[PDB]
Design a binder for these strands. Sequence first.
RNA 1: AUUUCACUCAUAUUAAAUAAAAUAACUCCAAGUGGGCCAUUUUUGGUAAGCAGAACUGGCGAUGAGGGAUGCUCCUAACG
RNA 2: AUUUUAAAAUUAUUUGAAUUUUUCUUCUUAUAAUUUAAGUUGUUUCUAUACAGUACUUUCUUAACCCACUCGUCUUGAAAC
Lengths: 186, 156, 66, 125, 223, 86, 180
Amino acid sequence: GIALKNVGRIKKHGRKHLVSKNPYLRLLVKLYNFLARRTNANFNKIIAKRLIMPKRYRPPLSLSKLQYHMANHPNDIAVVVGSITDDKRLFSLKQLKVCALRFTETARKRIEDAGGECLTFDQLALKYPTGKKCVLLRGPTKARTAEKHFGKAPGKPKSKARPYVRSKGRKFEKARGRRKSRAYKK
Amino acid sequence: GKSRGKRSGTRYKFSKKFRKHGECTANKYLEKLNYGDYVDIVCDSTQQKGMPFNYYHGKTGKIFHITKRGVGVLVNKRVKHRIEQKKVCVRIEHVRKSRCNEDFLLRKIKNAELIKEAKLKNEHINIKRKTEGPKPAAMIKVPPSKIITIEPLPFY
Amino acid sequence: AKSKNHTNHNQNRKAHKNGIKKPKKHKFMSRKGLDPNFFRNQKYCLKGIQKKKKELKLKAKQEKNN
Amino acid sequence: AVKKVGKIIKKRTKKFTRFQSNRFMRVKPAWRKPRGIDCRVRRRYKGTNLMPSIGYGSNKKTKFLLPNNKYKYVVKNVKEMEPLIMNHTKYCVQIAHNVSSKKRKQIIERAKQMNVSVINAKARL
Amino acid sequence: AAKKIKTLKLINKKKRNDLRQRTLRYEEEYESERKKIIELKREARKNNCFYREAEKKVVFVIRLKGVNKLPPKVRSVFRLLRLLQVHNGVFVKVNKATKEMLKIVEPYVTYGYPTLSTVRKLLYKRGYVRVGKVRRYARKKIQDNADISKHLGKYNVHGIEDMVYQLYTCGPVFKKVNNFLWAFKLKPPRKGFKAKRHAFNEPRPGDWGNREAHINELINRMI
Amino acid sequence: KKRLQNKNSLTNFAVRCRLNPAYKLLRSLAVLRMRKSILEKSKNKKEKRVQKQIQKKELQKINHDYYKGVAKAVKKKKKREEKKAK
Amino acid sequence: IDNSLNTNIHQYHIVGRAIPTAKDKNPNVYRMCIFAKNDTNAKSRFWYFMKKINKLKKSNGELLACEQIKERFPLRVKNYGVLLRYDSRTGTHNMYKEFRDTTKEGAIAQLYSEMAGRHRARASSINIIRISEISSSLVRRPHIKQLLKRRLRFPALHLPTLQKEYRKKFASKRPSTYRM
RNA sequence: AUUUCACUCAUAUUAAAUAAAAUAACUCCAAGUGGGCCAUUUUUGGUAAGCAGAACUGGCGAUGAGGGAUGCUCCUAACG
RNA sequence: AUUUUAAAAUUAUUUGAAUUUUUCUUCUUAUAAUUUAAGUUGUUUCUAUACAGUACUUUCUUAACCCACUCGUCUUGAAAC
Ligand SMILES: [Mg+2]
Ligand SMILES: [Mg+2]
Ligand SMILES: [Mg+2]
Ligand SMILES: [Mg+2]
Ligand SMILES: [Mg+2]
Ligand SMILES: [Mg+2]
Ligand SMILES: [Mg+2]
Ligand SMILES: [Mg+2]
Ligand SMILES: [Mg+2]
Ligand SMILES: [Mg+2]
Ligand SMILES: [Mg+2]
Ligand SMILES: [Mg+2]
Ligand SMILES: [Mg+2]
Ligand SMILES: [Mg+2]
């Protein structure tokens, strides 16, 4: 015998393949794997990796944050591997160039009315093979509500986690263990 | 039943040494402390206010709080599969400036001038410490009249 | 019938299976309950510094774009 | 033991028979993995039945070849054996069990014209 | 533009000539040291004095026990020395720290001082190399000088005699050369051991001590 | 690349000269001085006795004195202990 | 030349001292003569005795010489006397013995065999003091006096010892032990 | 204290050695367990026990192969 | 389908220098070939001038030599009186 850990076998931890059976997405994965391999640019590698991630790691990005992130990058291209949504809290939109996976109808209409354009990834692969003057962006990955229940258990000292409750009110879990008046707080 | 008090098992730990009783000197009250310093926790039993707990007697930490007569110290402690940071609040008599750091400080100060001189003459300097190694050869002079012969001894 | 009542046999093999973990080494910690009358003054110092910095930056922007 | 004819090597020829199937007739000879404490076959005692493992696997280059040194293809009518006109040196044909004699005569006659061998061209004669 | 191959073809030839010259000077050094030591001792006997020799700086260590039933502190040190199974063998540098590490594991090994010809025989008959990106290494046998120069030619070693030189004497490049080699895997000895239970210095047949210069005879029987 | 047979680096002359570009010269020189000396049976080896007379007489007195001294010291220790035991 | 008859004991001469210090900058020097199987064992015994007798440990000392004394007349027959000290199961004793040989280590080889055969004493429990040579007028043990008469003769009464290929298993006449 | 500007502190031999050191770090969802026993060394009750009760490590259990005639725990050594 | 290449070695003609002074002396400082490089090649015979024979492949049956306690289960522990 011999004294190795994990019998000498190396370990990896992430997702290895697509789960989705959409044929257009499979064509995209083939294309960008080829680009990443034959032009190792650290731009095509990251893209080829990101379009394999599950849904919870491809969050949406709104128009207002898109414009705010590109405020000091005029005449550049923003790249997102999620969806763009409209934002009714914006009053005015600039002229922008954006590539992404999906656009909502309202956001697509608003972008084109201000003089910009929307691109798909097979067009950015054709005009920007190595991602010159392209800026990679992503949306909030820890804003989902499910994340508000994770972490330290609600009942440990100074935990911010939400509990799982039938409903909300003065009659639902607010008496003993939540105020000093009933034997202790938290 | 079982008896686990706060001062249990400290009969010899918390006792003064021979012919060395009495309260502390007056210069102990003139020591300087600053944030981030290394410090030793040594309980002094003749001051009963703000004594540390049994476990921490003899440990070393860093300062995270200074008050009128108190100091907060960050100390590691092993709990069963991990190490936890503990926040220990003690009074000023049970506190001593740590000496575990001084060789590094002297080394830095002294190596500064050697580097400055070597670069001033544009030499090549090596400043890392050297582990004790094998010894070289030498020629040892010895008169024949000085070698004494020995042999095992009989039993008595 | 009686039984065992204590042993910590096999406990540090379990402890070393996932090693002895260590603290996290952050750069800042919270000053919630620490020495007051010193951190309130620090709040004032930092507000003054930020005011000066922002005013200079804003003035530079104002003249640069004209 | 090991059997070798040409370049084809078989690592074992005997079958794996089920433990205790020689002693009780309600136990069939098809292999089942032994589970259960105190088995003496699950624990690899010497002198008893062996277990099958992935080590006895065959060379990838010669895994499905017959002693003919070709692969086998089973056909059901005359039209099914169309693709064999391009690779007539790597494949041999066998006729399905439930085809009549009249259909078999036609299949055999076409296989001869294509220069492909038939494994069982003597049935129902 | 077939000039892309000719400049490389000249570079290889110049590299080969440089290696030849370096090897010849190494041979000179070996003969000179061997002769000087043989004269200093002869002069010491004449002038009523003793000439104590320099001590060794390098040992070769073999493992003697399997992987079952060991205390944890022994397992840690075996891992840090890169000795993982029964009859492995590696070179080790001699310091205060390595001596104390070697005292922990003494009853399970045996070691000694290797000669130049023993080093050469080990490197030519049982010499393997780690090739690849860091942490992906692909054990390969030497067969040529390309792999050596590719990984280690930044410190000016180009070929197998250069690392023989750097191993036999603790040259400036010892950590890299030693770490470049795979751990040696060796046969059992041709006439057996005496008793791995007992020590070399015990008045019985035994094996596990430090056998200073008798290591060469043993590792010629399992090479 | 496909792997091939690993050739014996010591007894296969072509690969031995491939790894060491200096081995041919060293081996040739060794063969030359080997043939010279074996050809000098009954022509040389006759004076090697003369050099024996030259330098063994030089070293003999020193070696003889050294071992004489060691032996005398061991004997003196014996007598010194035997006198004390009485 | 016949390795079936060799013992593996030789004699060595070792010299050593302590590493000089400020309190002692020219320390005493020591020598011994040790019988062992190789030079490494001789050094081990030297440091063992340095520790037991003086206050030297190998870790703060250095070695000056290791010689391996050879013998001058390996075909003349000498008389030897040996002084011992060894441990029994219930105490420790010291002894004097005599041997006849052509080498000192040849006599030490006999001594280890005899002390194992007669007293079950292991090499780990034996300390050797003062091997030397003794004249024939000062021999004490009767079994050595028998061997130094004027005209020593005796018959040979041992049984034959034959090569393995002539050591045949079906004989055709039962052999004789007489051999005159 | 904090903040802003200047100058400068060994690296390719890496501010002491060695290292199939990233086979790392961190989140989520869950199973099965919570009657144990044995050996060297230390050790409590008892005249003692193949008795009862603790400590560090290695094992049996969950594990077969060669040796100890035989043998769950001993020696070598762990399995395509 | 173009690294079984380059290089290295060998042999026979060469262009120059050393030294160890030589039918294996060195330094690819010019062309040709060969393998010791660049993981086995050749010659004879048989099967045989056969179409299933007593030969070859294969499946059963019966010996020898070595080895092999009754499965499932609860249990620290099962071949278990
Ligand atoms: Mg294996
Ligand atoms: Mg089969
Ligand atoms: Mg079981
Ligand atoms: Mg033999
Ligand atoms: Mg043996
Ligand atoms: Mg043992
Ligand atoms: Mg086991
Ligand atoms: Mg027995
Ligand atoms: Mg039998
Ligand atoms: Mg049996
Ligand atoms: Mg169980
Ligand atoms: Mg029971
Ligand atoms: Mg059972
Ligand atoms: Mg019973």
